[PDB]
Amino acid sequence: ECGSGNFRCDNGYCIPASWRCDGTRDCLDDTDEIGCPPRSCESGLFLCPAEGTCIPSSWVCDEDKDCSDGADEQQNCA
Amino acid sequence: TDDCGDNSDEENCVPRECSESEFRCADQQCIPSRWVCDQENDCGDNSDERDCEMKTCHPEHFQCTSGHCV
Amino acid sequence: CESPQRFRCDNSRCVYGHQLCNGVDDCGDGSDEKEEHCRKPTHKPCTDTEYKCSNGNCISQHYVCDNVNDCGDLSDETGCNLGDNRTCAENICEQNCTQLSSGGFICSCRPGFKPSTLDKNSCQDINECEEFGICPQSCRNSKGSYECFCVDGFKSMSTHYGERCAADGSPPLLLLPENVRIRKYNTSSEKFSEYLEEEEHIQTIDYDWDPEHIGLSVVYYTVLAQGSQFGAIKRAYIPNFESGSNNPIREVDLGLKYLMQPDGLAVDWVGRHIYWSDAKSQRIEVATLDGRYRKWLITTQLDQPAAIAVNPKLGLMFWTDQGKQPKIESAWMNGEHRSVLVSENLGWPNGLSIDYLNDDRVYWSDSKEDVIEAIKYDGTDRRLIINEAMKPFSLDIFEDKLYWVAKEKGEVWRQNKFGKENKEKVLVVNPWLTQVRIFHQLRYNQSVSNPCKQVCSHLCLLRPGGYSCACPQGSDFVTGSTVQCDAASELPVTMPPPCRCMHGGNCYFDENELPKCKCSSGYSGEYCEVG
Ligand SMILES: *[C@@H]1O[C@H](CO)[C@@H](O[C@@H]2O[C@H](CO)[C@@H](O)[C@H](O[C@@H]3O[C@H](CO)[C@@H](O)[C@H](O)[C@@H]3O)[C@H]2NC(C)=O)[C@H](O)[C@H]1NC(C)=O
Numbered sequence: 001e002c003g004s005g006n007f008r009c010d011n012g013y014c015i016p017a018s019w020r021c022d023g024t025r026d027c028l029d030d031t032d033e034i035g036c037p038p039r040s041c042e043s044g045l046f047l048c049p050a051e052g053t054c055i056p057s058s059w060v061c062d063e064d065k066d067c068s069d070g071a072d073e074q075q076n077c078a
Numbered sequence: 079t080d081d082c083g084d085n086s087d088e089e090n091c092v093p094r095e096c097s098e099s100e101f102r103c104a105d106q107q108c109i110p111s112r113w114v115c116d117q118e119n120d121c122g123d124n125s126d127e128r129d130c131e132m133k134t135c136h137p138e139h140f141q142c143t144s145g146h147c148v
Numbered sequence: 149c150e151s152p153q154r155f156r157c158d159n160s161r162c163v164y165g166h167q168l169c170n171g172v173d174d175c176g177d178g179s180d181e182k183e184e185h186c187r188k189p190t191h192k193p194c195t196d197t198e199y200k201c202s203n204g205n206c207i208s209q210h211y212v213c214d215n216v217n218d219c220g221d222l223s224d225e226t227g228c229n230l231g232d233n234r235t236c237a238e239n240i241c242e243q244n245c246t247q248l249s250s251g252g253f254i255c256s257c258r259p260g261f262k263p264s265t266l267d268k269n270s271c272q273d274i275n276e277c278e279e280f281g282i283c284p285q286s287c288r289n290s291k292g293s294y295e296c297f298c299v300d301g302f303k304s305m306s307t308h309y310g311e312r313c314a315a316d317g318s319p320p321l322l323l324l325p326e327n328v329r330i331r332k333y334n335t336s337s338e339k340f341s342e343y344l345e346e347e348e349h350i351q352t353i354d355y356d357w358d359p360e361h362i363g364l365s366v367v368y369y370t371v372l373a374q375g376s377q378f379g380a381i382k383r384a385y386i387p388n389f390e391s392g393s394n395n396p397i398r399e400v401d402l403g404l405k406y407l408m409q410p411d412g413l414a415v416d417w418v419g420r421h422i423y424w425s426d427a428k429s430q431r432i433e434v435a436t437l438d439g440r441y442r443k444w445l446i447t448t449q450l451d452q453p454a455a456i457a458v459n460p461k462l463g464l465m466f467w468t469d470q471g472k473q474p475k476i477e478s479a480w481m482n483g484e485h486r487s488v489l490v491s492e493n494l495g496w497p498n499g500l501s502i503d504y505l506n507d508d509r510v511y512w513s514d515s516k517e518d519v520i521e522a523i524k525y526d527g528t529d530r531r532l533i534i535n536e537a538m539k540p541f542s543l544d545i546f547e548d549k550l551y552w553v554a555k556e557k558g559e560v561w562r563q564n565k566f567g568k569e570n571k572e573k574v575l576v577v578n579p580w581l582t583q584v585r586i587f588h589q590l591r592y593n594q595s596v597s598n599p600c601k602q603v604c605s606h607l608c609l610l611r612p613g614g615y616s617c618a619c620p621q622g623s624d625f626v627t628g629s630t631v632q633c634d635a636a637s638e639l640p641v642t643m644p645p646p647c648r649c650m651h652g653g654n655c656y657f658d659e660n661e662l663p664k665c666k667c668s669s670g671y672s673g674e675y676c677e678v679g
Pocket residue numbers: 052299300301505593594595596597
């Protein structure tokens with residue numbers, strides 16, 4: 001084990017906490033960017049996960065392929 | 079080698095496989111394994127001498143710091 | 149000289165039938181190749197008693213919803229719900245609701261929309277951005293509309309036969325390697341200028357844009373093994389400015405000894421590593437830009453590794469094998485997750501290039517099948533771009549055009565990169581020509597941050613969304629650690645000072661061989677910059 005401020009990767013190598021959720025893998029098993037709180041945007045809007053921009057309830061569930069993933073009509077419109 | 083006298087044997091020659099103690103040269107030729115990194119050009123273009131900082135020698139051979147076996 | 153069958157030109161001579169606006173002046177005043185009467189004079193108004201259908205097919209209302217297709221795409225039958233007890237005022241249809249003569253409401257999807265496929269009387273917007281070559285650089289979707297926006301560093305410039313976006317800087321140079329010399333060529337100035345000379349057995353070229361920001365890029369080049377002497381990977385500065393012949397280029401070997409035929413070389417500008425593929429050694433390996441810490445990367449199932457490429461944005465390397473089993477394989481820069489992209493309908497895949505600015509699409513040149521094809525980086529949507537390419541040897545992509553070398557002709561050829569239009573010839577050089585490469589900064593995105601945290605001891609290779617540690621060949625990690633390796637570190641290699649005389653003047657070696665310029669008329673400074 002190591003210090004309180006160091007996040008431990010499953011293999012035993014422990015990295016600083018600042019490198020959690022930093023946008024880059026650092027663990028060989030990617031665990032520092034896995035299990036990390038996903039992005040979100042303000043009320044009535046949605047973030048298309050594939051490109052990461054705020055889109056409105058005009059286009060989520062507009063019956064068609066408004067997000068770059070094409071997936072709103074099943075992943076949002078459940 | 080031209081044996082017939084008219085190169086009949088060597089025409090359309092497919093290079094042979096190497097056997098268990100032979101190394102296949104760059105230009106598809108087989109030589110004794112003991113000729114690899116022996117401080118001499120045996121494959122015609124020193125292709126045997128290529129990149130032997132990263133291999134051990136035979137049990138009875140001493141290895142120079144340059145990778146050659148003596 | 150009657151308009152319905154003969155084009156009456158301005159000079160009072162008339163032109164027979166289809167010759168009007170065919171691409172060659174049959175009139176003799178230039179107006180034969182003009183818009184006038186030949187180019188789109190009428191746009192077909194149709195009445196309440198017709199439907200001008202989905203594709204412009206105008207058909208009588210009696211045929212609309214009669215259960216017999218006139219329109220071709222069956223759009224005169226779309227919906228076709230029937231009963232005079234029904235009106236458009238009940239609003240079943242999502243958008244262009246209309247009333248028919250028989251049996252009540254009938255409704256079209258708006259131009260730029262198709263019927264919902266899960267139901268009739270409902271329509272989706274077409275995502276036109278999925279169509280290949282609909283926009284030059286970027287596409288944004290809207291309800292039956294889109295925009296051909298282009299990314300930062302590209303000014304929108306209206307052009308002939310469509311709009312494109314400019315280079316926002318100095319016109320691109322081509323690099324043209326021959327066995328004895330590398331040559332430059334300004335695509336706008338259209339002049340050769342001297343560069344690396346008195347060399348021998350050159351084969352391939354890549355560059356790093358201005359690593360020290362002192363206004364000098366560096367090109368890496370390969371020398372083949374000859375007779376009984378090994379090859380080399382060597383590197384030298386090249387001016388980004390207009391200077392040449394007056395600047396003695398000094399070659400330096402990286403010291404990567406035991407090297408035979410490096411037919412493929414690529415420089416990772418983000419990871420500061422150089423990737424090359426030795427055909428004779430049957431491997432593709434990596435080392436730092438100065439030639440230290442050599443590590444074999446991929447050594448299995450390689451017959452004859454051809455030209456390679458790297459995409460630091462996606463952390464994916466690409467390479468081609470032109471042996472008995474031709475294939476195009478991609479992998480991480482670390483060397484894990486090796487996979488085969490395309491292995492069918494392949495001849496001699498010998499030149500490969502990635503379109504960074506267009507969905508990171510991959511193009512390659514086949515010198516045996518005589519074709520150039522493009523595939524998405526994951527390997528779906530294969531389409532031949534240009535055929536009858538006269539055996540392309542090498543290719544590179546820049547702006548809205550694709551460049552290649554027609555090998556035995558020694559010619560450099562150019563074409564729309566989306567497969568449209570017709571081929572163009574740029575210039576003619578020796579059959580010793582072995583590449584074309586566009587020397588420009590927009591060609592390699594310089595604002596791609598290296599994810600490495602300096603943690604790695606010797607090498608910090610890239611991988612998708614991160615990095616990884618490695619150490620030279622014939623060494624291993626210190627037990628229990630995945631960062632430090634037992635091999636002794638080596639100091640970085642010092643590159644000799646370059647010659648820098650921009651607007652003119654001649655370089656000169658002083659007592660300690662430091663370069664110095666004799667400034668020309670009307671210019672001053674240590675490097676003759678301002679005057
Ligand atoms: C070369 O690569 C760089 C990235 O290394 C590209 O820069 C990014 O381009 C996008 C395009 O629209 C911008 O949004 C990025 O700005 C950033 O956006 C995020 C949200 O997605 C914000 O959190 C940031 O604050 C910032 O606004 C931009 N990123 C950076 C670091 O510049 C660039 O487009 C690309 N260029 C070419 C020619 O390919």
